[PDB]
Amino acid sequence: GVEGEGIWLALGTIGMLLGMLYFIADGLDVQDPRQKEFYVITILIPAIAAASYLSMFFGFGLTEVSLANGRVVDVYWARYADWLFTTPLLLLDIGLLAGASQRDIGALVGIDAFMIVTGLVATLTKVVVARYAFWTISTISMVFLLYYLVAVFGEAVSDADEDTRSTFNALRNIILVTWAIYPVAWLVGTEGLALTGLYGETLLFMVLDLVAKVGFGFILLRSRAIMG
Amino acid sequence: EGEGIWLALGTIGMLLGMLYFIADGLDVQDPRQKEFYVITILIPAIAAASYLSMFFGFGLTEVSLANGRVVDVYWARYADWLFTTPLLLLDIGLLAGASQRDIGALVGIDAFMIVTGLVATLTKVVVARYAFWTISTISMVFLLYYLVAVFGEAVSDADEDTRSTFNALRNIILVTWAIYPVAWLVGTEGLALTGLYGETLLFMVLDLVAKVGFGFILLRSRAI
Numbered sequence: 432g433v434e435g436e437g438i439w440l441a442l443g444t445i446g447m448l449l450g451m452l453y454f455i456a457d458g459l460d461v462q463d464p465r466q467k468e469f470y471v472i473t474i475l476i477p478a479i480a481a482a483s484y485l486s487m488f489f490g491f492g493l494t495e496v497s498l499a500n501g502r503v504v505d506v507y508w509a510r511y512a513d514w515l516f517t518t519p520l521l522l523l524d525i526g527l528l529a530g531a532s533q534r535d536i537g538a539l540v541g542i543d544a545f546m547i548v549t550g551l552v553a554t555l556t557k558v559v560v561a562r563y564a565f566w567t568i569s570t571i572s573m574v575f576l577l578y579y580l581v582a583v584f585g586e587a588v589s590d591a592d593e594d595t596r597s598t599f600n601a602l603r604n605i606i607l608v609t610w611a612i613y614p615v616a617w618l619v620g621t622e623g624l625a626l627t628g629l630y631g632e633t634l635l636f637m638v639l640d641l642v643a644k645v646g647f648g649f650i651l652l653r654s655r656a657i658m659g
Numbered sequence: 660e661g662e663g664i665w666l667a668l669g670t671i672g673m674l675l676g677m678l679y680f681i682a683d684g685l686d687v688q689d690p691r692q693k694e695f696y697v698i699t700i701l702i703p704a705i706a707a708a709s710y711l712s713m714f715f716g717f718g719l720t721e722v723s724l725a726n727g728r729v730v731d732v733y734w735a736r737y738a739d740w741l742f743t744t745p746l747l748l749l750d751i752g753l754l755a756g757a758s759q760r761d762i763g764a765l766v767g768i769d770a771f772m773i774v775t776g777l778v779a780t781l782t783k784v785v786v787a788r789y790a791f792w793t794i795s796t797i798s799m800v801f802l803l804y805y806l807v808a809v810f811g812e813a814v815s816d817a818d819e820d821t822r823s824t825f826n827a828l829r830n831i832i833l834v835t836w837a838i839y840p841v842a843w844l845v846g847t848e849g850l851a852l853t854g855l856y857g858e859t860l861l862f863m864v865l866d867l868v869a870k871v872g873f874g875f876i877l878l879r880s881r882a883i
């Protein structure tokens with residue numbers, strides 16, 4: 432790619448298509464409207480992400496920023512477009528599985544979308560302390576997201592049968608653990624401190640996205656907690 | 660009903676083709692080639708997004724006719740064909756060495772054909788259905804004629820590889836595009852000689868051969 436990162440973009444692409452395939456194929460033996468609902472939402476997730484990843488491997492959704500630093504940073508802004516559509520969808524999925532109110536769910540995507548958007552400005556500002564600034568409020572907003580996820584969606588599902596509560600716990604644990612890594616991957620890649628470059632950052636976002644989208648969806652879709 | 664299976668299979672196969680082309684795309688290093696890889700990869704992706712919808716049941720509304728019948732129309736196919744058939748046209752075209760005005764003209768006729776194809780599907784007045792189906796079927800003849808006539812002479816001075824690859828690609832287009840007006844005819848939207856099931860199976864076939872069979876020949880061609 433630009434700095435060897437093209438392999439991750441490609442594996443990421445195919446990893447998403449493969450998970451999407453499995454979900455589709457597993458969609459065939461579905462017989463319940465509530466079940467089909469999680470299926471559409473869940474197939475949608477890596478669909479979109481695969482699109483994003485594919486456009487980046489072609490060389491679309493890739494721009495350059497000149498920082499006041501005098502450093503020039505290579506930004507795959509398509510990630511953010513992807514995340515803007517997909518991360519609310521992940522919130523929808525688990526919120527619906529949790530029995531959370533529509534208001535509860537909206538509350539969360541609201542903060543989520545704020546998160547992705549402040550991440551986008553932190554990625555694009557030429558003023559370098561403003562990159563750290565907007566990264567920080569972006570991480571403050573993520574911490575609140577993750578607080579409200581376990582508190583609010585966890586209280587909502589606390590009266591479900593074991594299957595639903597534990598499928599929920601597993602999902603919320605995939606989110607707690609993988610999402611929390613995103614800002615650290617950002618901080619250490621070219622976008623933040625530039626410890627590792629583009630190569631290391633892409634790979635991490637590639638591993639994290641796959642766990643976050645395919646691993647997530649596989650666990651949810653392989654659960655009867657999404658029937659009714 | 661039960662056509663949902665071919666819609667799922669259609670997505671899978673389509674995604675499969677996209678998978679083959681992507682893994683095949685890693686090797687590309689000429690900008691010209693890349694350009695063929697993205698147009699081509701984008702074709703089954705749009706179609707995958709298309710079958711996906713009709714699988715979910717999204718995009719399959721019902722129209723009741725003047726003569727009383729109420730035909731289930733998967734309108735999403737028309738949304739697919741609207742972007743996809745001109746991408747296919749752009750593919751052979753660029754491969755043919757044809758001009759922007761050569762290629763533009765054709766998608767002008769391709770757009771006309773698809774759209775009157777849509778109104779023929781959606782008209783409740785059955786004389787109009789057949790009228791619009793006919794005028795669209797005849798657009799295609801112009802389309803297909805100009806395609807071998809004008810793209811054919813564009814590629815005639817090229818190398819044997821692209822020539823032979825082009826002929827192959829106009830052959831696929833010739834053979835499979837010409838079935839589409841008869842799939843529409845013998846199916847629920849036309850004379851209902853087949854149900855949703857066997858009409859879908861058929862359109863699933865044609866779409867795989869016309870998109871993936873096509874892409875495979877092109878992307879795996881020595882020419883590109």
Ligand SMILES: *C/C=C(C)/C=C/C=C(C)/C=C/C1=C(C)CCCC1(C)C
Pocket residue numbers: 740743744772773775776777779791792793795796797799836837839840841843866869870
């Ligand atoms: C990949 C999708 C392809 C190649 C779709 C092709 C569609 C056509 C050639 C449609 C043709 C039609 C007519 C010629 C007239 C009646 C309406 C249509 C849709 C059947």
